[PDB]
Design an enzyme around this catalytic site. Structure first.
Site, PDB file in Angstrom:
ATOM      1  N   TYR A  62     -15.254 -34.883  32.538  1.00  0.00           N
ATOM      2  CA  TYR A  62     -16.196 -34.352  33.549  1.00  0.00           C
ATOM      3  C   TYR A  62     -15.541 -34.655  34.864  1.00  0.00           C
ATOM      4  O   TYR A  62     -14.909 -35.723  34.935  1.00  0.00           O
ATOM      5  CB  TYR A  62     -17.573 -35.055  33.554  1.00  0.00           C
ATOM      6  CG  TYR A  62     -18.349 -34.632  32.333  1.00  0.00           C
ATOM      7  CD1 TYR A  62     -19.099 -33.466  32.288  1.00  0.00           C
ATOM      8  CD2 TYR A  62     -18.279 -35.415  31.192  1.00  0.00           C
ATOM      9  CE1 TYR A  62     -19.813 -33.118  31.145  1.00  0.00           C
ATOM     10  CE2 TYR A  62     -18.954 -35.073  30.037  1.00  0.00           C
ATOM     11  CZ  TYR A  62     -19.730 -33.912  30.032  1.00  0.00           C
ATOM     12  OH  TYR A  62     -20.386 -33.652  28.856  1.00  0.00           O
TER      13      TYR A  62
ATOM     14  N   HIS B  49     -16.219 -30.446  34.825  1.00  0.00           N
ATOM     15  CA  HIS B  49     -15.633 -29.288  34.178  1.00  0.00           C
ATOM     16  C   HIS B  49     -16.500 -28.086  34.620  1.00  0.00           C
ATOM     17  O   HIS B  49     -17.675 -28.203  35.001  1.00  0.00           O
ATOM     18  CB  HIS B  49     -15.302 -29.451  32.702  1.00  0.00           C
ATOM     19  CG  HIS B  49     -16.475 -29.511  31.788  1.00  0.00           C
ATOM     20  ND1 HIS B  49     -17.071 -28.315  31.547  1.00  0.00           N
ATOM     21  CD2 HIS B  49     -17.153 -30.427  31.067  1.00  0.00           C
ATOM     22  CE1 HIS B  49     -18.053 -28.593  30.743  1.00  0.00           C
ATOM     23  NE2 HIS B  49     -18.180 -29.845  30.378  1.00  0.00           N
TER      24      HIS B  49
ATOM     25  N   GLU C 291     -19.911 -28.862  36.483  1.00  0.00           N
ATOM     26  CA  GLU C 291     -21.018 -29.720  36.033  1.00  0.00           C
ATOM     27  C   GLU C 291     -20.504 -31.127  35.956  1.00  0.00           C
ATOM     28  O   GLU C 291     -19.324 -31.331  35.701  1.00  0.00           O
ATOM     29  CB  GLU C 291     -21.417 -29.312  34.670  1.00  0.00           C
ATOM     30  CG  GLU C 291     -20.433 -29.039  33.559  1.00  0.00           C
ATOM     31  CD  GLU C 291     -21.194 -28.883  32.253  1.00  0.00           C
ATOM     32  OE1 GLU C 291     -21.548 -29.993  31.815  1.00  0.00           O
ATOM     33  OE2 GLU C 291     -21.343 -27.777  31.763  1.00  0.00           O
TER      34      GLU C 291
ATOM     35  N   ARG D 298     -27.341 -32.587  33.910  1.00  0.00           N
ATOM     36  CA  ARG D 298     -26.154 -32.232  34.697  1.00  0.00           C
ATOM     37  C   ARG D 298     -26.409 -31.702  36.087  1.00  0.00           C
ATOM     38  O   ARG D 298     -27.306 -30.885  36.197  1.00  0.00           O
ATOM     39  CB  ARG D 298     -25.304 -31.123  34.040  1.00  0.00           C
ATOM     40  CG  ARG D 298     -24.875 -31.381  32.645  1.00  0.00           C
ATOM     41  CD  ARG D 298     -23.728 -32.355  32.523  1.00  0.00           C
ATOM     42  NE  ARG D 298     -23.485 -32.585  31.115  1.00  0.00           N
ATOM     43  CZ  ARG D 298     -24.093 -33.282  30.167  1.00  0.00           C
ATOM     44  NH1 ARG D 298     -25.134 -34.017  30.491  1.00  0.00           N
ATOM     45  NH2 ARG D 298     -23.703 -33.203  28.888  1.00  0.00           N
TER      46      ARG D 298
ATOM     47  N   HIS E   4     -30.241 -30.200  29.011  1.00  0.00           N
ATOM     48  CA  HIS E   4     -30.175 -29.806  27.608  1.00  0.00           C
ATOM     49  C   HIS E   4     -31.549 -30.071  26.995  1.00  0.00           C
ATOM     50  O   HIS E   4     -31.941 -29.472  25.971  1.00  0.00           O
ATOM     51  CB  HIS E   4     -29.105 -30.558  26.806  1.00  0.00           C
ATOM     52  CG  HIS E   4     -27.678 -30.126  26.911  1.00  0.00           C
ATOM     53  ND1 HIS E   4     -27.298 -28.825  26.687  1.00  0.00           N
ATOM     54  CD2 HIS E   4     -26.528 -30.777  27.179  1.00  0.00           C
ATOM     55  CE1 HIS E   4     -26.002 -28.720  26.814  1.00  0.00           C
ATOM     56  NE2 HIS E   4     -25.498 -29.868  27.131  1.00  0.00           N
TER      57      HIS E   4
ATOM     58  N   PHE F  95     -29.009 -24.767  27.967  1.00  0.00           N
ATOM     59  CA  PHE F  95     -29.533 -25.477  29.109  1.00  0.00           C
ATOM     60  C   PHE F  95     -30.722 -24.667  29.643  1.00  0.00           C
ATOM     61  O   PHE F  95     -30.845 -23.459  29.546  1.00  0.00           O
ATOM     62  CB  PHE F  95     -28.587 -25.652  30.255  1.00  0.00           C
ATOM     63  CG  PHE F  95     -27.363 -26.478  30.212  1.00  0.00           C
ATOM     64  CD1 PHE F  95     -27.459 -27.855  30.347  1.00  0.00           C
ATOM     65  CD2 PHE F  95     -26.100 -25.905  30.066  1.00  0.00           C
ATOM     66  CE1 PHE F  95     -26.340 -28.644  30.337  1.00  0.00           C
ATOM     67  CE2 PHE F  95     -24.940 -26.687  30.049  1.00  0.00           C
ATOM     68  CZ  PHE F  95     -25.100 -28.065  30.194  1.00  0.00           C
TER      69      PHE F  95
HETATM   70  N1  LIG Z   1     -24.822 -23.824  27.849  1.00  0.00           N
HETATM   71  C1  LIG Z   1     -23.683 -23.684  28.557  1.00  0.00           C
HETATM   72  N2  LIG Z   1     -22.605 -24.410  28.218  1.00  0.00           N
HETATM   73  C2  LIG Z   1     -21.428 -24.322  28.884  1.00  0.00           C
HETATM   74  C3  LIG Z   1     -21.270 -23.484  29.983  1.00  0.00           C
HETATM   75  N3  LIG Z   1     -20.025 -23.602  30.462  1.00  0.00           N
HETATM   76  C4  LIG Z   1     -19.382 -24.499  29.672  1.00  0.00           C
HETATM   77  N4  LIG Z   1     -20.240 -24.956  28.698  1.00  0.00           N
HETATM   78  C5  LIG Z   1     -19.886 -25.930  27.661  1.00  0.00           C
HETATM   79  O1  LIG Z   1     -20.613 -25.930  26.438  1.00  0.00           O
HETATM   80  C6  LIG Z   1     -21.374 -27.109  26.448  1.00  0.00           C
HETATM   81  C7  LIG Z   1     -22.564 -26.932  27.402  1.00  0.00           C
HETATM   82  O2  LIG Z   1     -23.651 -26.627  26.559  1.00  0.00           O
HETATM   83  C8  LIG Z   1     -21.038 -27.959  27.645  1.00  0.00           C
HETATM   84  O3  LIG Z   1     -20.947 -29.418  27.369  1.00  0.00           O
HETATM   85  P1  LIG Z   1     -21.976 -30.293  28.229  1.00  0.00           P
HETATM   86  O4  LIG Z   1     -22.988 -30.790  27.288  1.00  0.00           O
HETATM   87  O5  LIG Z   1     -20.946 -31.141  28.869  1.00  0.00           O
HETATM   88  O6  LIG Z   1     -22.371 -29.255  29.226  1.00  0.00           O
HETATM   89  C9  LIG Z   1     -19.744 -27.365  28.031  1.00  0.00           C
HETATM   90  O7  LIG Z   1     -18.515 -27.964  27.598  1.00  0.00           O
HETATM   91  C10 LIG Z   1     -22.372 -22.675  30.358  1.00  0.00           C
HETATM   92  O8  LIG Z   1     -22.493 -21.907  31.302  1.00  0.00           O
HETATM   93  N5  LIG Z   1     -23.528 -22.861  29.632  1.00  0.00           N
END
Ligand SMILES: Nc1nc2c(ncn2[C@@H]2O[C@H](CO)[C@@H](OP(=O)(O)O)[C@H]2O)c(=O)[nH]1
Length: 105
Positions: A37, A39, A57, A76, A91, A99
């Site tokens: 992170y 990312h 995020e 996030r 989440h 999300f």
């Molecule tokens: N749901 C969602 N996930 C994303 C997006 N861009 C990247 N992701 C990735 O998929 C997983 C996010 O659901 C994220 O891990 P995270 O739990 O760190 O966000 C991340 O790595 C996005 O726009 N939406």
């Protein structure tokens, strides 16, 4: 010391948000990551963001400490390459790996 954003049942104050955005941004600016992170956040979900992307995020923590590695939890903060705040997402209450937006205005 109102809830700038509320993530599920977690109450985040403006000062919580600015510390999480500041932390994620110092890393972003330094080309670094801690356990992946910050990312890029794709905005697959279709959210509104008062500011323009690319979006990134960073975990915002339930306990009020800034993330420095480990389990990220479910919340996030979203920010852009200009250190502008886009919003807070979670989440929590989201299906699988989706999300939902955190309540505010
Ligand atoms: N749901 C969602 N996930 C994303 C997006 N861009 C990247 N992701 C990735 O998929 C997983 C996010 O659901 C994220 O891990 P995270 O739990 O760190 O966000 C991340 O790595 C996005 O726009 N939406």
């Amino acid at each position: 010391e109102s809830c700038e954003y509320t993530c599920g049942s977690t109450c985040y104050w403006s000062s919580d948000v600015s510390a999480a955005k500041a932390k994620g941004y110092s890393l972003y600016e330094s080309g670094d990551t801690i356990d992946d992170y910050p990312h890029e956040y794709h905005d697959y979900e279709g959210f509104d963001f008062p500011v323009s992307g690319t979006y990134y995020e960073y975990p915002i923590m339930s306990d009020y400490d800034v993330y420095t590695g480990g389990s990220p939890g479910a919340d996030r903060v979203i920010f852009n390459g200009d250190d502008e705040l886009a919003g807070v997402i979670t989440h929590t209450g989201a299906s699988g790996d989706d999300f939902v937006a955190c309540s505010s205005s």
